[PDB]
Write a protein that binds this ligand. Sequence first.
Ligand SMILES: O=S(=O)(O)c1cccc2cccc(Nc3ccccc3)c12
Ligand SMILES: c1coc(CNc2ncnc3nc[nH]c23)c1
Length: 159
Amino acid sequence: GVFNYETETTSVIPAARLFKAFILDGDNLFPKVAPQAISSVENIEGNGGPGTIKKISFPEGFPFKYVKDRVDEVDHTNFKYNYSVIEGGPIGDTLEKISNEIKIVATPDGGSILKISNKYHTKGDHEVKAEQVKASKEMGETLLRAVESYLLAHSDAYN
Ligand SMILES: O=S(=O)(O)c1cccc2cccc(Nc3ccccc3)c12
Ligand SMILES: c1coc(CNc2ncnc3nc[nH]c23)c1
């Protein structure tokens, strides 16, 4: 079945710029700005649109070695990005995939709000735990804050 988890978080970076950096250029930025969270990002196949597969490797000592993510949809107009965790890490005989949707909306103060859904597609009679979802949220927030710091410090990047 499907377990749905949702969260909202804020950023001080404007929506379009955050989308360009944090979403569209995560392959470059995450290992650069958060090497203690993400060791590398490998493009396995595809040119960045729907169907693109990336292998995200974690540092030594982390719970999982890697995950392979698949880009599902990229909406450059509405700052929407959908992708799925499709192999590695928690994926296996209890979990088929994790389907994620991110939408970034502008705020009047010149920042943004990120609205995130994660849908866990399980196999058989297994349940998703608070701690698994929490670990994913912590990671997402860590990457967000690292990218945000970089973008504050590098004003000519991603305009
Ligand atoms: O989806 S993620 O791509 O890891 C993600 C991406 C970007 C920012 C995120 C911020 C908070 C939580 C996330 N994950 C999350 C995990 C569980 C429930 C709700 C959100 C974030
Ligand atoms: C939320 C947290 O990180 C992202 C960037 N999305 C993303 N990053 C790196 N590889 C991906 N492959 C599919 N989606 C990917 C969105």
